[PDB]
Amino acid sequence: PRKIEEIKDFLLTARRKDAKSVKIKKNKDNVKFKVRCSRYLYTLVITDKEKAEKLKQSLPPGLAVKELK
Amino acid sequence: RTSPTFRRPKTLRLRRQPKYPRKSAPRRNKLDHYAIIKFPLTTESAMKKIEDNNTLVFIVDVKANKHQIKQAVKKLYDIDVAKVNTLIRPDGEKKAYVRLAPDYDALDVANKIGII
Amino acid sequence: SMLRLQKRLASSVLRCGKKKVWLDPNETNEIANANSRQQIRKLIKDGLIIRKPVTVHSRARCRKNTLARRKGRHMGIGKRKGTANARMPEKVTWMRRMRILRRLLRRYRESKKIDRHMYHSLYLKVKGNVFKNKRILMEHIHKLKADKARKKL
RNA sequence: UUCAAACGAGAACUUUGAAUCGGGUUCAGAUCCCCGAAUCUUGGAAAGCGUCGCGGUUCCGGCGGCGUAAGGGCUGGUAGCAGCCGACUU
RNA sequence: AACGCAGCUAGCUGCGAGAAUUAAUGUGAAUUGCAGGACACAUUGAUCAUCGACACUU
User: Fold this and answer.
1) With b meaning 16 or more CB within 10 Å and e meaning fewer, what string describes B12-35?
2) Phosphoserine-modified residues are where (chain B)?
3) Which uninterrupted H or E stretch holds C125?
């Protein structure tokens, strides 16, 4: 697995042709955005709630979204 | 001559051009797709695989390899194969676990043979 | 009637030994009807089969003695079987002494209590087994420092 | 070794009770099957594991609730002081 | 020499993925433990024998 550290990279790697789905995990203190690519499972962790929804509106269309919670 | 050793010179070698073929006709392929698959298997443990693993179990010729098994089942029952796992039973028969592609399903297919 | 199979399966599912598997004595009929790990998982939820607790082996008796042994209650001449070196090696005792004494000399050196020349002389003497204790070493600098002060004055 | 019970025509001797990695999966196979990852943190809690319950009784392989006397060291500034801590010994 | 081949088949026997046999010729209503399959018997065919065609795994 790989950790995406800054916001801009995550929506890029989500736009790759090999990105099959993104899974959103809702924890007590953070929300994890995991995108399953061909070779790695990239994870972006944000510690504050308000950015989670705004990013959630901005996934590329057609890419499968799974809500773990 | 800059070297003190004498090596055999390389001479022309002609490709064989037979005046007649030693075999009159090519041997017929006696190990075909119908020979690849002997019969499907119906044991209790097998049934679990068709339901939970989308996999068919077959008794196959002992000389067939995984590639040969995959091609035979595809053209015999018009399906796609994801992977094939084979083992040699203690009785000496080769058992092949052929897993279909996700788009195909083993239930309706195995009805077509009549096994299921 | 025949529950050998069910006890083996229960132990595998319960991840415990067969000695810890309890089969209901007056419900035997439908455990005998269980022949799959699924059916075993059916029964352990309904309480027909449960995991017996581990046999108790309390350490309180040994814990009580160690507290008494902490004060030397059972360390007399009649309770020793090995040699003094075997019970407590002399090398580790010597190894401990050099470490705790050489540490003090280093600390006294960096604290400017003593200088390099005095450090080296004591460092060879501590290796010479002239001191046996921190206090025994510690007061030695004091007479050494005392005469040095007297020498200047 | 003993007591009781069950099955059984029949019981000292039968059965029950009492004295390339991670996770799942079978009656029998798992680093091989399935899932997921590859060649302090992401993985990771979703898993797993403990308990407390609700459904169902060859169907649900379904649901949730919680929890995971002498021998030394350290710390702060007269031959150390002051505090704290710690085994095993003679 | 090995390994396989029978609807039910372990050995013996026969056979070789065309595997208790294919083709052809002769013969002419069976094979048989059970079942099934047969069987205008020439508008030509079970079985058996013969055996020159074909085939004959390592």
Assistant:
1) eeeeeeeeeeeeeeeeeeeeeeee
2) 3
3) helix C116-127
Instruction: Please check whether strand D approaches the CB of C83 to within 7 Å.
Output: no
Helix (H), strand (E) at residue C142: helix C134-152
Region of residue B23 (left: phi > 0; alpha: psi -120 to 50; beta: else): beta
| Contacting subunits of A (3+ beta carbon pairs below 8 A) | none
Integer Cα distance of B107 and B54 in angstroms: 8
Structural contact between residues A35 and A41, judged by C-beta atoms closer than 8 angstroms: yes
Contacts of residue B76, defined as CB under 8 A and 6 or more positions apart, other chains included, come to B33, B34, B37
| Cα gap C20→C51, rounded to integer Å | 6
Q: What element of type H or E holds B49?
A: helix B44-52
Q: Which residues neighbour A65 within 8 Å (Cβ) at sequence distance 6 or greater? A: A21, A22, A24, A59
CA of A49 to C1' of D9 (A): 78
